[PDB]
Amino acid sequence: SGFRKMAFPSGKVEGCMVQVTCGTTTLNGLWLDDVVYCPRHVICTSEDMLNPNYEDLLIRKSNHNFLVQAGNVQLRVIGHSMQNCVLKLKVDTANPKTPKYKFVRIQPGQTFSVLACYNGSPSGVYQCAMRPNFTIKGSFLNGSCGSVGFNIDYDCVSFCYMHHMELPTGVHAGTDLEGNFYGPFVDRQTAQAAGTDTTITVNVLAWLYAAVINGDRWFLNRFTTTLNDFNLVAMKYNYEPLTQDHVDILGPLSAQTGIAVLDMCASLKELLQNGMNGRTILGSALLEDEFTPFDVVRQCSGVT
Amino acid sequence: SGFRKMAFPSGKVEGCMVQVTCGTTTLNGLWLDDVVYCPRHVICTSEDMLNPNYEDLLIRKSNHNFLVQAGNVQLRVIGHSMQNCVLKLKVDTANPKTPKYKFVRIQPGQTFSVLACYNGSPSGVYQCAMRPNFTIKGSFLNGSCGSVGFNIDYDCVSFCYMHHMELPTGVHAGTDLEGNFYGPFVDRQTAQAAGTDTTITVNVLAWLYAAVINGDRWFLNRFTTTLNDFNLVAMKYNYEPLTQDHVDILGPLSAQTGIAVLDMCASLKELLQNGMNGRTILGSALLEDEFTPFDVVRQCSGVT
Ligand SMILES: *CC(=O)N1CCC(C(=O)Nc2ccc(OC)nc2)CC1
Numbered sequence A, B: 001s002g003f004r005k006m007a008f009p010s011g012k013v014e015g016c017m018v019q020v021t022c023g024t025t026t027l028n029g030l031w032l033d034d035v036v037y038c039p040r041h042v043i044c045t046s047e048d049m050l051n052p053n054y055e056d057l058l059i060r061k062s063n064h065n066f067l068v069q070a071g072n073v074q075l076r077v078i079g080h081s082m083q084n085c086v087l088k089l090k091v092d093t094a095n096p097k098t099p100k101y102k103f104v105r106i107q108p109g110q111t112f113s114v115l116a117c118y119n120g121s122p123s124g125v126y127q128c129a130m131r132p133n134f135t136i137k138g139s140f141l142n143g144s145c146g147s148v149g150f151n152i153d154y155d156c157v158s159f160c161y162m163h164h165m166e167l168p169t170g171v172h173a174g175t176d177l178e179g180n181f182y183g184p185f186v187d188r189q190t191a192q193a194a195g196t197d198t199t200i201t202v203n204v205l206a207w208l209y210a211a212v213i214n215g216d217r218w219f220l221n222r223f224t225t226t227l228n229d230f231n232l233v234a235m236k237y238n239y240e241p242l243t244q245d246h247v248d249i250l251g252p253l254s255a256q257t258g259i260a261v262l263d264m265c266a267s268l269k270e271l272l273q274n275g276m277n278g279r280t281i282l283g284s285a286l287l288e289d290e291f292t293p294f295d296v297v298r299q300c301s302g303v304t
């Protein structure tokens, strides 16, 4: 028992981290097979970031200008190309530690682990979620760009995020491994404000199921609700609308606990309207939304 | 910017996890050099756990009864011994992936990462703290015994915990890598109640410094206090006493932010007496105590 914000074991991803330097900018790259993926803003000076024309800046760069270092050994760059907001640096050596991998573009509400890196070296691993406004709330200092987000299914790493920037509000924006930003963000140092950071309702319900499974049951009430009634309350509290797809996804947790999804919705409705009254759920004084129903099942079953 | 509950990259520890089976019990072992460390309760049946005499149970065991599997390959056991509550199984092969390592016994308030494992396979990594009552609040299902806690200093892994049991209250107890339990706990299925789980004051202050560094400043007040005055309030709220050693340890955070430690104590005193009033600090509605001053400096500076 016990329920923790858990990240995937990071070993498979640590074996892929490299340092990429272009001129005076050094960030992280992801080495899979004979390709190193990194943010295209590695070619920018701090001045260039104000209004960069990436195609024009890239013309002044040759393969030998991209310095790629894996550990303390240099990789030879034999090609470079820009795909959306990422650069793909072809190297002459396949990464011997390349795990089975996929590039996936996640939806808002989906969680992933981040291996925060500096100078191609891993510093830490933490779990986060793609927010409904397409930002993530990470922990990234200068030099962390190119750090990646991922999920693991047994031995296959699904890379879903690459870090590119911090908005002026301290929230983070990045791309999938095809270089397409999540949300409307651009790799330019300009006014980019995030939209409403709503709560991921289906994740909160999954976490309330985890709480029941782990013995924290005080919030369970004698009520039920409907999807439409619940959603009226969810709208009021800036919670995402709950759909029948979400109810279906919560089915196995409902089955395990014997608590109907709409009954759990009614408990959540009362928590929104009455508050926690100084009480906690799974050691938290607020409703946690960075556990998906899949994460709750995985952690409560012990998937390796 | 941003501040997350971050675990150490787990790769170095993943390379040490093995499966240990004795009869019908299978748990995890830690393979360093030619020795596999595991909880001695691997020799117990579910019945034996009620009142085990480990020396007597061990007499009926031979090297060939300990099945050690690293990945899908079997290790040959050439010796076994009991050191306190851990078994040391000498194998004929040194772990080729053994990192530089130390065995350390941590003090309450100290944090570490746990690589939760099942059948010798890593399932997840999370960060926790040795509570002042010598329990940890982990996430451990059956089969997770032998999972370890650790800290990393660049390339050296300091192992500090091995998981052994879950108390009837859902909290966890375990040993250092010398097999000595933290706290008064025993590897027996008997009435073992934990003492008061007090809050780690020095860690809360470190986390309030992290909050200021990251822009969350609403809780800063116009007051100061003394160590004695603060401690009167800390006692009332089940917070650990703050010592001059703790104030000294917080010195670099005080220097970086320009906020004197006793001023931060006065802010914490007001948060204890007035509550959060529905507000949050670093995305939390309660005062976080599982970040040490060293963790705050490390995360706020980017140590790899
Ligand atoms: C995430 C990352 O690694 N980045 C590269 C460095 C970059 C940065 O520091 N930019 C910057 C420099 C100087 C000034 O002056 C106003 N502003 C921003 C952030 C992204």
Ligand SMILES: *CC(=O)N1CCC(C(=O)Nc2ccc(OC)nc2)CC1
Pocket (backbone or CB within 6 Å): B026, B027, B046, B141, B142, B143, B144, B145, B146, B164, B165
């Ligand atoms: C942490 C771990 O791996 N453990 C080994 C299994 C053990 C267990 O499941 N014990 C147990 C079995 C049957 C009964 O019946 C009442 N109680 C406890 C827990 C520790």
